[PDB]
Design a protein around this ligand. Structure first.
Ligand SMILES: Nc1ncnc2c1ncn2[C@@H]1O[C@H](COP(=O)(O)OP(=O)(O)O)[C@@H](O)[C@H]1O
Ligand SMILES: Nc1ncnc2c1ncn2[C@@H]1O[C@H](COP(=O)(O)OP(=O)(O)O)[C@@H](O)[C@H]1O
Ligand SMILES: Nc1ncnc2c1ncn2[C@@H]1O[C@H](COP(=O)(O)OP(=O)(O)O)[C@@H](O)[C@H]1O
Ligand SMILES: Nc1ncnc2c1ncn2[C@@H]1O[C@H](COP(=O)(O)OP(=O)(O)O)[C@@H](O)[C@H]1O
Ligand SMILES: Nc1ncnc2c1ncn2[C@@H]1O[C@H](COP(=O)(O)OP(=O)(O)O)[C@@H](O)[C@H]1O
Ligand SMILES: Nc1ncnc2c1ncn2[C@@H]1O[C@H](COP(=O)(O)OP(=O)(O)O)[C@@H](O)[C@H]1O
Ligand SMILES: Nc1ncnc2c1ncn2[C@@H]1O[C@H](COP(=O)(O)OP(=O)(O)O)[C@@H](O)[C@H]1O
Ligand SMILES: [Mg+2]
Ligand SMILES: [Mg+2]
Ligand SMILES: [Mg+2]
Ligand SMILES: [Mg+2]
Ligand SMILES: [Mg+2]
Ligand SMILES: [Mg+2]
Lengths: 306, 306, 306, 306, 306, 306
């Protein structure tokens, strides 16, 4: 089969970059809405006997884009494609992954089921909120890591990285922080609400590393505790920058040295209203995974380099 | 089990009307959206061992209401309810029911499959675009009719109904038109585009009967053809009035005697900007079907009276 | 994989014609019945890793041919074939496609489910009664059209086709009629029972176009209404000619100029007892669809020519 | 729920007797055929919230009866019944239960899958050809035994039963023969083709016991071998008497003392043309099984008495 | 229906205690092994129309107990029970819940799938390793907490609990520790390998709280780090005490004040060879969940008291 | 794709022999157990886009080996292999294939279902206890025969085979012996318990042929009956030699001329403690089936030669 790369309405810029690294052109698909706000999908080329890849990120209008993804997957399945792969840099409803309330839903499993009945055979995603979402599917699921690119940014941009500290803004983020600290051979701390800090922090550069920042109610309160606790400068490094609601107003009025995110969510608009925001490119990692999945090579090689 | 009636964000007024006819109160559910525009559903009462009935219409913002419905169904299924029934007065994506294009989707079947994997056991809907959507499910599906209420309106409001004529604005609507005409003993006509009229029409009160009006393009060119053909006055009777886009601007600048719709879609806002719009209450037919499904009575009795 | 063409008991002549156009030979299968009237299927060649195509029409004795088809599909699936495609020129139980009665079945969906659990991956059919039966399956379904061959016959055989009129014998057949009329730039009419005619007809050659004729209770009554309404000669063009029951006795005692059908159902025996019956060959359209599905070409090209 | 007993076109008499033993009336269902030989099913009462039982035997026109059964099960399932039980005294396609040929089907598993996807929840059958057809299903399957009635008939009718012999006409029927012989405390023999006899037989009454007799090509050659081997009189006892093909011509021209069968298949017509045929009533056992399944009693009690 | 309580080979003592709180007798089931070490299950009562509950913990020989559970669930499903619930205090293969290696299995999802196809409808478990295993099922899953009983033990036994500290032996156990600290209004610490401690712990009683201890390689190294860091006495509180391999030899040769575990795994043999081990009874929490699930009461009430 | 041969813990010697006939090396997989006796599976090569074959026999610790098989199948399915085939020379739980008791399980169907949800696409086995287990799967199942190798052994080793007799130790084994007798043109006998013998036996060499011997409470008592009935010497030929429990002590204390088995179960340890045991190599038949399934050749050719 031949790679047929398709792009949804969300994050059109990343799909163009992945096409460039793969050395191909995006497929002909027109995705608009009808008068009554119903998704319209018009694929403009034959997907018969092809390896269709669709890039759709859980950003912007989550529900509008999610239905767009399911209609595109189902259209390519009935149009007699060979395999259909959903490339989702940010997984929607990933924070609703367990039932710790009375009648709470598990919306991550509902989205997993809906992608399965549309007809997707493979899933490629980056830095899932819970790694266990891989078990919500009966199909192969790729969970790429942005950590090798995060480590590269720290070494080149922060000069004092050899004698810095790494801070976790939440109790559940200690797994991510401890892995990064060992790779840099530095110390680490942890911040818990209900604000308590456990770690030296004083008179050293502190880096806040999390997986996502929706409204930045965290990290911004964490930065105040870090500056009150003796740290000189504070850095914030994140993978998925949603920056919804106040968010930008909190970052613009905070004392972060820099806020660093990836390409998983469109950052072009947010970067106009915040000079602290910096972006790490991940289109190289996504293009390599699509390349190796198509050719039947080892994706495990990606978890050994940048 | 006990009836537990829930209402989604869409069409809150009909759910209250159905609750009054059933003589109960709506269940405690809070449906908001998070900062990143993700649906939040919080059921505030035990649904364990209950007959849950969720009323959600495919109107307004379709994709956000549809994802609202699936989260509510899945939450009630995992919360150990006895049965879950989706009451959907207007079915979303009902116009995409076949594949007559190159790589077209069938989004009616995708929506059908999503309701199945959420965990719905029964579907109650009214006046489907295609009756064959009943076969898109492997569960019982109820297809109610607004025709008995349509015929009741004609007999009381139009005085010349004994010598009127029903006009079909399209070629695919001849099934509805001929059934109505035979039930009234009056003649019928038909209008086809690419605009042609077959039927007397001249010096007679013409009634345009269709199942739906989205942008009212068809019921506007048809009305102009009817007034140019000799009909004194033109009436339009519809079941699902979406009235999206121009729609209202076309109805206000038209020569309809009246435009008549049902409760399936909220008409309170549209009736302010158009005096030609009239509403037929259908909350009694929905309440009776919910009542009879719970009590194990014959729903076929509904198709013999009003 | 290699095409392996198999033929069921029904319509052996079309399978031979399709084999000739494809330039191959029919596979070795022996289908008889045991003493207790149970279907016996004996495939006499290896189907391992092959693209199996089974041609079975819903004609003759429906239930014995339908069980024949399911046994053949299941035998080829367990025999490790690559893909199995059911080519069904006339779909059985296509008229039971909805539930508009008290405890009516939907037998079109039951037959759809049986073909799925036998192991079919693709369905190729022509001129379904309802196009929505495509959504009764979760697999690709091809719905071919006999209209390009219908229009070709009219142009060469009826000399007055430039000033003729197409008549719909029922209210639900107005979709086929209006599409044909626009493609010929001529007018159209419509006949409804409970018998009333709308259209000129008078002093014009009327053509009755329908999708199928089982007992010819319709068209035969329509022709009488057309001859009493001023039409000179009446033609009838149909896709699936079952001609069961009286049928032939009604056609022989009618005033049709000609009755025209296709190859979907065996017409060799019926043509002996009726001289008005003419046949349109469709073995080229079926062979092209089989050829293009195997080669991964565009079947949409078939809906642009003859 | 309430028992709703339905009867298919096959074996109306057994259904009437089962209704009599249960003290109820058969449900209102009309099952005829259309002009093109398609099954028509018209249930004439509400099955909503009921325990529907359908009695259909695999006899006569096997395929038409099987389609009838599937259509009835699906109609009762979609019509919102509580449970649907298929009571099948003789299972169709039970002899095709394994793949011992090149591309042979396993039609028993296909029938099992079709019954599963129609919507049946329970299966009640008597004396399956292979007991593993119980494992062909994912639902409960009852396999009743006619052996107690066979033993009762042997005791009351044959006077010399205390010093008789029991003969198996095939190598695969040695299990039934050994079980019956042990229950009667008599000896046993076996007959194999490719005819060889292993047993005394000489100067004693020999009883041929099998599970079914389709064409009676066996048992007749077995009877000739037994009469040539020194046995005085030969009896034949069977469970399912199909008697298709020559069958009756072979029994009338044979030297059986009596041929004894059960009610699983209609026997009145065959009993008209053969004086040797005798029938054992099994309606009591089926009625008891239905009664105990409805009331949630122990069906295992039936395998301890008559 | 009626509660039918069944017990597997593993942890026979807890099943007896749960039966006593529910005020009933355990069901009659004999579970032995054949000569070739295959599980034999012999239920000695009618489960027809009953609410069957089976108590089986993932301890001892995991694979023999897991196959025992599936055979009991499947036997009770085919025996026409009403509902089947698996009560699993310790879930097997809970630590293999994600794919973070080259070709790693996710054996938690395989066990989830094998419980689904056996026929279980509900799962009751306590303190899952990952809460997300709830989403590995499409059925309701109860995740009980042993924390309220853990808090009761600390207050009753440790006198210095008002000025103690809670220590996490791993980076991933920070979620449990921070929640317990807030409930007691005390401080907390964290220990990470690759052994580094963050927190005071000097001159105060330190409590190590985890979810399970398999070989006690952790907690034993953590205790050495705590005692050399200035802590006075060290306590270890765990939920699932496996104590496999050396385990006991490490606890007997350590400086724990006490090792406290729950009833999820049999502890009677371990406490003979270790005086430091203490058991917390949870048979009241399991009995209440079983009682409330059967009666259709709120299980959420259990997460507000002891 | 490429053949990737994997071996489980059970029967490492047969896998090596099959690898040699196929001319390849076994795949890199390490299978051990954790401290708490849970299966660990670590594949050391890329199975991506490969035809994976796993050889695992139902011997030794059945439950440990069965869970090992499912973990290996599921790991290779999620690792994006092309096809996964389970080669099982001896099928676990094959004797529990029907429900002839009150609440008996059918554990052969449970094992079939667990192999289906792990992700296996093909099953290769030898001499199933019941041939109908092929219908317990919805996937192709190969049922190889050891009979051609059994016939070869008799002709080469037993000199009196031309005037010998074949004895079946059970009523259910008459199918095997009658087929073997016809291929040798010799006589046959049968032994039934509740011990009675039918057949000459006297003054001739008797061969006892069965499918398996677990504990030899079967042939051993049959051999005693044969020697007291006049047979000169007794041979025992079996396919699956389990030899569990007493087994060997009964064979060592019996009067068998020889006990002959196959490679389906490891025999190396048994032949140390029994000189009567002889082994027939079947690694050539398994290698040919694996070779032909991969290459898409006819497996039916194997049932015409050795
Ligand atoms: N899009 C969203 N925006 C804000 N909150 C969300 C969103 N989706 C889910 N949530 C809520 O946020 C909570 C996330 O909790 P989390 O910090 O992940 O707990 P833990 O750290 O124990 O996993 C969930 O309980 C969920 O109810
Ligand atoms: N550190 C890691 N090394 C290798 N794989 C990892 C790692 N972390 C997570 N994974 C997961 O393991 C999977 C390995 O991909 P897979 O296709 O099995 O590799 P291969 O091509 O060698 O079979 C990836 O999809 C990834 O999600
Ligand atoms: N004119 C009609 N009369 C009766 N039923 C109809 C009609 N039109 C459609 N139906 C369908 O028939 C179904 C009858 O409901 P059902 O529960 O089967 O009736 P009962 O309660 O008698 O079993 C309805 O769900 C409806 O969708
Ligand atoms: N007028 C039409 N033009 C194109 N396709 C049509 C038309 N009418 C119906 N169809 C449906 O569209 C499908 C197109 O086949 P498909 O394999 O999707 O095309 P492609 O090979 O270009 O992907 C056909 O199976 C047919 O059923
Ligand atoms: N001799 C036998 N005794 C009991 N059951 C048998 C026997 N032979 C076969 N069976 C099977 O065992 C099943 C027992 O039915 P079941 O509903 O499990 O009994 P209970 O009502 O006691 O649970 C029957 O359906 C029958 O098919
Ligand atoms: N703190 C908590 N409060 C309530 N429920 C919780 C909590 N933590 C987890 N849960 C989960 O919520 C579920 C509530 O059970 P459910 O049957 O929904 O209760 P109800 O009967 O009120 O609907 C439990 O199964 C449990 O797994
Ligand atoms: N005597 C026999 N001859 C041929 N096939 C047999 C015989 N006995 C059993 N079989 C079954 O028939 C199957 C034939 O395999 P299959 O893949 O259909 O062959 P082919 O490649 O010729 O289609 C085997 O899997 C086997 O289980
Ligand atoms: Mg979380
Ligand atoms: Mg339409
Ligand atoms: Mg129709
Ligand atoms: Mg047989
Ligand atoms: Mg873990
Ligand atoms: Mg057996």
């Amino acid at each position: 089969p031949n790679i047929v790369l398709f792009s949804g309405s969300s994050h059109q810029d990343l799909s163009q970059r992945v096409a460039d690294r793969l050395g191909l052109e995006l497929g002909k698909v027109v995705t608009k809405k009808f008068s009554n706000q119903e998704t319209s999908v018009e694929i403009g080329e034959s997907v018969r006997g092809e390896d269709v890849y669709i890039i759709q990120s859980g950003c912007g209008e989550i529900n509008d884009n999610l239905m767009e993804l399911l209609i595109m997957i189902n259209a390519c399945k009935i149009a007699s494609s060979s395999r259909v792969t959903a490339v989702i840099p940010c997984f929607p409803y990933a924070r609703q992954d367990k039932k710790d309330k009375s009648r709470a839903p598990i919306s991550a499993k509902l989205v997993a089921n809906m992608l399965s009945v549309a007809g997707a055979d493979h899933i490629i995603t980056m830095d899932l909120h819970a790694s266990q979402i891989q078990g919500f599917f009966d199909i192969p699921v790729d969970n790429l890591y942005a950590e090798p690119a995060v480590l590269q940014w720290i070494r080149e941009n922060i000069a004092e990285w050899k004698n810095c500290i790494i801070v976790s803004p939440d109790a559940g983020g200690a797994k991510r922080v401890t892995s990064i600290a060992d790779r840099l051979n530095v110390e680490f701390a942890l911040i818990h609400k209900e604000m308590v800090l456990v770690g030296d922090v004083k008179d050293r550069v502190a880096i806040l590393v999390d997986d996502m920042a929706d409204t930045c109610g965290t990290i911004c309160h964490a930065a105040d505790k870090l500056l009150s606790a003796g740290a000189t400068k504070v850095y914030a490094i994140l993978t998925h920058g949603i920056f919804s609601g106040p968010a930008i107003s909190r970052i613009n009025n905070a004392a972060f040295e820099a806020v660093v995110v990836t390409n998983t969510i469109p950052q072009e608009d947010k970067m106009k209203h915040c000079t602290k925001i910096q972006v790490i490119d991940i289109s190289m990692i996504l293009a390599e995974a699509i390349r190796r999945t198509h050719n039947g090579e080892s994706v495990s090689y990606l978890f050994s380099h940048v």
